[PDB]
Scaffold this active site. Structure first.
Site, PDB file in Angstrom:
ATOM      1  N   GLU A 156       0.877  -1.066  -0.069  1.00  0.00           N
ATOM      2  CA  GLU A 156      -0.083  -0.060  -0.013  1.00  0.00           C
ATOM      3  C   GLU A 156       0.879   1.087  -0.016  1.00  0.00           C
ATOM      4  O   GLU A 156       0.450   2.091  -0.833  1.00  0.00           O
ATOM      5  CB  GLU A 156      -1.049  -0.042   1.218  1.00  0.00           C
ATOM      6  N   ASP A 211      -6.365   8.399  -0.384  1.00  0.00           N
ATOM      7  CA  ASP A 211      -5.864   7.318   0.607  1.00  0.00           C
ATOM      8  C   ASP A 211      -4.673   8.029   1.394  1.00  0.00           C
ATOM      9  O   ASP A 211      -4.014   8.681   0.815  1.00  0.00           O
ATOM     10  CB  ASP A 211      -5.185   6.113  -0.301  1.00  0.00           C
ATOM     11  N   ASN A 223      -7.606   9.200  -5.580  1.00  0.00           N
ATOM     12  CA  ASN A 223      -8.698   8.152  -6.491  1.00  0.00           C
ATOM     13  C   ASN A 223      -9.406   9.031  -7.314  1.00  0.00           C
ATOM     14  O   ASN A 223      -9.524  10.159  -7.325  1.00  0.00           O
ATOM     15  CB  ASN A 223      -9.366   7.461  -5.266  1.00  0.00           C
ATOM     16  N   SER A 227     -11.875  11.101  -3.764  1.00  0.00           N
ATOM     17  CA  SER A 227     -11.177  10.855  -2.622  1.00  0.00           C
ATOM     18  C   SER A 227      -9.774  10.504  -2.466  1.00  0.00           C
ATOM     19  O   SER A 227      -9.144  10.508  -3.523  1.00  0.00           O
ATOM     20  CB  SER A 227     -12.011   9.558  -1.877  1.00  0.00           C
ATOM     21  N   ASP A 238     -12.586   8.939  -7.884  1.00  0.00           N
ATOM     22  CA  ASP A 238     -13.740   9.681  -7.497  1.00  0.00           C
ATOM     23  C   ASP A 238     -13.651  10.874  -6.522  1.00  0.00           C
ATOM     24  O   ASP A 238     -14.672  11.388  -6.145  1.00  0.00           O
ATOM     25  CB  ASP A 238     -14.724   8.547  -6.401  1.00  0.00           C
ATOM     26  N   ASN A 272      -8.867   5.376   3.212  1.00  0.00           N
ATOM     27  CA  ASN A 272      -9.649   6.457   2.199  1.00  0.00           C
ATOM     28  C   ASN A 272     -10.723   7.472   2.887  1.00  0.00           C
ATOM     29  O   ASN A 272     -11.677   7.034   3.483  1.00  0.00           O
ATOM     30  CB  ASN A 272     -10.442   5.438   1.318  1.00  0.00           C
TER      31      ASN A 272
END
Ligand SMILES: [Cl-]
Ligand SMILES: [Cl-]
Ligand code: NA
Ligand code: NA
EC number: 3.2.1.17
Length: 129
Positions: A35, A52, A46, A50, A48, A59
């Site tokens: 990750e 991380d 991301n 959002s 959309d 998220n």
């Protein structure tokens, strides 16, 4: 902070992740490697809108507030910036909530694609724990 492998394993043990919800320590170390490359400062946007955050790439749509993800939830009740600290407590406490929400570690895409079904014990081999 960029952790070493065994240093992170020891910190995750201290914080209660070994066998948490049945996931052995190596699963958590493997997920963190893929990750974030063990970097607490990691961020990634991301599609959309959002973002991380941190060692476990938590998220903002669901878990933390970053002030720029409309309609999102803050189910861990923390600012997303808290997940970037050299102290992993906030990331671990939020991860415990995530892994308990029904889907286990499948919530972490990198875990499902790169760790699940592999010899995750190897990630803690050699470490003093
Ligand atoms: Cl820590
Ligand atoms: Cl599970
Ligand atoms: Na393990
Ligand atoms: Na949010």
């Amino acid at each position: 902070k960029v952790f070493g492998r065994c240093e992170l394993a020891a910190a995750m043990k201290r914080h209660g992740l070994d066998n948490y919800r049945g996931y052995s320590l190596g699963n958590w170390v493997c997920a963190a490697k893929f990750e974030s490359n063990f970097n607490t400062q990691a961020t990634n946007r991301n599609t959309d809108g959002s973002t991380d955050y941190g060692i476990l790439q938590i998220n903002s749509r669901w878990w933390c507030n970053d002030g720029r993800t409309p309609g999102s939830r803050n189910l861990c009740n923390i600012p997303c910036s808290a997940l970037l600290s050299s102290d992993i407590t906030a990331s671990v406490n939020c991860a415990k909530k995530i892994v308990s929400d029904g889907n286990g570690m499948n919530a972490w895409v990198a875990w499902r694609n790169r760790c699940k079904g592999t010899d995750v014990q190897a990630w803690i081999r050699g470490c003093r724990l």
